Amino acid sequence: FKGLDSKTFLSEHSMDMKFTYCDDRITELIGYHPEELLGRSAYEFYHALDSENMTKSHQNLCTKGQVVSGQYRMLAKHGGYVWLETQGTVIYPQCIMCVNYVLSEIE
Amino acid sequence: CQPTRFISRHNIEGIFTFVDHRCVATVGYQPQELLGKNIVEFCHPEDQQLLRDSFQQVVKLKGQVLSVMFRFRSKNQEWLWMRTSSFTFQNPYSDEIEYIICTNTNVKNS
Numbered sequence: 001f002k003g004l005d006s007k008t009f010l011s012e013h014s015m016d017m018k019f020t021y022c023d024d025r026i027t028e029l030i031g032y033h034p035e036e037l038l039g040r041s042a043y044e045f046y047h048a049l050d051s052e053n054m055t056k057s058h059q060n061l062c063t064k065g066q067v068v069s070g071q072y073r074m075l076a077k078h079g080g081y082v083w084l085e086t087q088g089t090v091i092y093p094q095c096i097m098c099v100n101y102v103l104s105e106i107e
Numbered sequence: 108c109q110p111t112r113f114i115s116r117h118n119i120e121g122i123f124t125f126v127d128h129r130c131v132a133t134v135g136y137q138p139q140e141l142l143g144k145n146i147v148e149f150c151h152p153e154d155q156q157l158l159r160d161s162f163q164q165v166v167k168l169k170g171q172v173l174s175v176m177f178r179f180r181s182k183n184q185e186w187l188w189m190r191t192s193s194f195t196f197q198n199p200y201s202d203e204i205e206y207i208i209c210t211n212t213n214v215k216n217s
């Protein structure tokens with residue numbers, strides 16, 4: 001069992017969804033070092049079955065300025081997927097600020 | 108040219124509870140020099156009340172972004188214009204107190 005702070009991590013993205021920053025809490029949760037995510041699009045990490053839904057959420061984020069993503073799976077560093085939900089906010093567009101919270105263990 | 112910016116997390120009072128290490132390039136301090144201190148301690152006297160009041164209101168705005176411009180004292184004791192975009196977060200599965208997420212960008216006053 002993990003407390004709330006431990007299951008949450010912040011990320012920043014350019015408008016194309018490429019990571020520009022990720023907080024180190026992701027490492028214990030999903031396996032990645034922040035440095036290895038930088039410059040990679042978030043879209044590289046979504047499960048195939050969430051891809052169309054996340055495209056829609058990204059569209060909603062860009063049109064409205066904020067979004068709650070809905071549940072989706074992020075590819076983990078060493079295989080499998082973690083369920084997450086993300087609150088995204090556009091900073092004005094300059095970048096996207098995400099608060100990400102894990103909903104499952106790696107599966 | 109990429110704007111110089113860093114992310115911070117604050118409690119509702121204004122205390123830094125997380126600081127992204129891009130702060131060093133933006134304002135010259137290490138994260139440890141900011142953590143535990145109120146953002147207002149780095150704010151120009153003229154802007155301090157505005158900053159306090161911004162932090163007080165952002166928690167009432169249902170998670171929308173509130174922006175504020177203020178002068179931030181760099182590690183070299185010089186006033187840098189910052190545009191801080193802030194919003195509240197609380198994990199919806201909980202009733203933990205909201206905290207404030209900030210993106211802090213050095214901008215021009217021109």
Ligand SMILES: O=[N+]([O-])c1c(Nc2cc(F)cc(Cl)c2)ccc2nonc12
Nearest residue numbers: 011013042045057058069074086088100
């Ligand atoms: O960056 N976004 O704009 C964005 C997301 N970012 C994100 C953050 C992560 F930590 C991991 C992943 Cl795979 C995506 C995740 C879900 C989203 N839904 O709409 N935009 C989203």
